[model samples]
Target: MGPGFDFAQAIMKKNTVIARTEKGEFTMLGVYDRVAVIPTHASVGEIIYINDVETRVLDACALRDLTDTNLEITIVKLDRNQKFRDIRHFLPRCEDDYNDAVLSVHTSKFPNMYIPVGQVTNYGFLNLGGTPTHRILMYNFPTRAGQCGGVVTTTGKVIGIHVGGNGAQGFAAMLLHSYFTD
Candidate 1:
């Protein structure tokens, strides 16, 4: 945990929501009113559950093959009944050499707790071979499975969604800023 842990936790508690798709369960970050950011692991065609309530995926930000790129965000059209106030927004620039106290909400070990993993080191197009490419941010720490929920910065704003990482390279987060801009 770092200096921004406390601020990140507050954002997570207000914006993080539980989502389930068939056999898998994970976290979703609420953004811009009735839209929430979700991981690609979930199915959009099937019934998706948000806080146990029924819903469906509005759209996935996939170009060709969904996993080909580092853009791991899937947008779900949320019901108007659920109002997410002042959802955390992303930083204005594409970070490459940036450092700050970062936090992730909804991990594999603890679903309710906000885990302060580490700081974001860089950002770019990463091609590990699945889809076209992945526009992601590499972090200085490692994250567990199913921890691909919401990641917040010290500014109390969300930067991306957590993605698993290797031993030396560290963890990754799918930048969700594009969801808002384009």
Candidate 2:
């Protein structure tokens, strides 16, 4: 089974906890599959998830395309699924300052958004037995207020990004994994 991933670079310094970056923003980065690259526009309030998986990106908007306009990206090691369990398991035991400075920055991004339609939940499935399909849900549909885009991963490749998910019943997209290579 492919290990679960983590954005190790997505941490905040103790002194920078309340400080905004030079860009005047605080962000928690997320990775999706290769297909998350197509949406011409993405924003917060958009609901995103792995194709058929229940894990959803509560609030998202396109930030930066990996190369040119292509969303495919490469990075360091993929944090194993056990690491996620450890994070959740040990997070509660961490010192408040450490948790606030490190753990909180990582976990706060998704849960901080408003629940538009479905209840936000976490997916415990794995790629070894699970399908590569992933999905994004834009509860508001057609509105582009606080959207963000991200890459999907299975074997550590960008499969898709947050594109569109606002139509009759709302919409979302998944950059299928079959198109990319190892």
Candidate 3:
């Protein structure tokens, strides 16, 4: 009974465009539905190439720690010359309600094919090596090596960003609403 809990149904109706770094040298997941938001870790060079063009990183943030949920998030601003029309107006928002369900959008091996219907199986902290931090567990969410930058949303509002995960499940760091607003 949370906001956009019905996002699962809306996800399947959308397709995503490929995001490349350094002129297709590196391929990663990119959300084209709205303004492009990809992971900083996905970049290999100084410029991000997307939609057959290149753009400089207007801003970026390093992850505070592997378990630091709020700080693990990274936002990229594309140059105006490389900007394109976004399909949707929905944007990321911070929500404290973890008991509710959520969805994630990921890409397939084939180009332009995306799966945006992942369901949140659990919400808690994961300890890979040290103390655990906030994370969301999802089922049926397949994250590839470069696709860790995909967007996870609820209804139309983004809840997290695909950072990393395992075969059984996937993990996404909750979106820090303050970062965008601040």
Candidate 4:
């Protein structure tokens, strides 16, 4: 999407550590070939993580082709009134034209750390159904204003992108290894 945000950068960087605005630290981990273990009746506010990856998947959708669907998203922050003022505006008018409905009401689930990882750097959203129109959305912490686009993970290829949200826990549905070989 932008400078410092590249697929090559994502791949080159190994064991990247991302922390939540809240408490506790999650280790960044990735799987070679696997499917996200999603629960059947999960809600929107749930947060999920994969392997040892500190990054969490938030505001994920169950619908395969989610281009037209309206989503109610919640941003998890460390401080009760910590405003991620930068990328707040960009979420609505995503460059990809995805209508993501981020709620004005915020929730501070975690607290800031002594070594804050910055805003919007540890978040992401992905649709791994093998469609060109819809790819993955990922990013580092401290999302700035008008910066909500991420890299593309082509059919099995992991591209660079910015992801948002950290509500649920577990792996994602999209499989990099499986998507590529099939």
As a TM-score, model 1 comes out at 0.77
Identify the candidate with maximal lDDT.
1
| Residue 81 lDDT (model 3) | 50
**What is each predicted model's overall lDDT from 0 to 1?**
0.60, 0.24, 0.49, 0.25
List model 3 lDDT by residue over 1-182, tens digit each: 33454553354344234566642322232334224445444543456655456666565555454444543444555554533334234544444444334543434344333454445655656663243455444546555555465556655555656666676566766654444443
Off by over 4 Å in 4: 1-64, 67-81, 90-133, 136-182
Best by TM-score: 1
TM-scores for candidates 1 onward, in order = 0.77, 0.24, 0.59, 0.21
Candidate 2 on 1-182: residue-level lDDT in tens? 11223322221111111111122222223222321122332222222222222233323333223333322122211222311111111112211111101112211233222222222112211121132222332233232323233222222222222332334322233333332222
lDDT of candidate 4 over 1-182, digit per residue (tens): 32223322332243122332232222222222221212122232344423233333533334333464312112222211112222111112222221111101111221111111221211234332232223333323343321112222222233222323333211112222322221
- What lDDT does candidate 3 reach at residue 168? 57
**Over all chains combined, what TM-score does candidate 3 have?**
0.59
Give the higher-lDDT candidate: 2 or 4.
4
Query: What's each prediction's clash count?
Result: 9, 46, 0, 51
Candidate 3 stretches with Cα past 4 Å from truth are: 1-17, 22-36, 63-70, 82-108, 112-122, 127-137, 140-146
How much is the lDDT of residue 90 in candidate 3? Answer: 54
Q: Which residue segments of model 2 deviate by more than 4 Å?
A: 1-38, 41-111, 114-116, 119-144, 148-161, 165-168
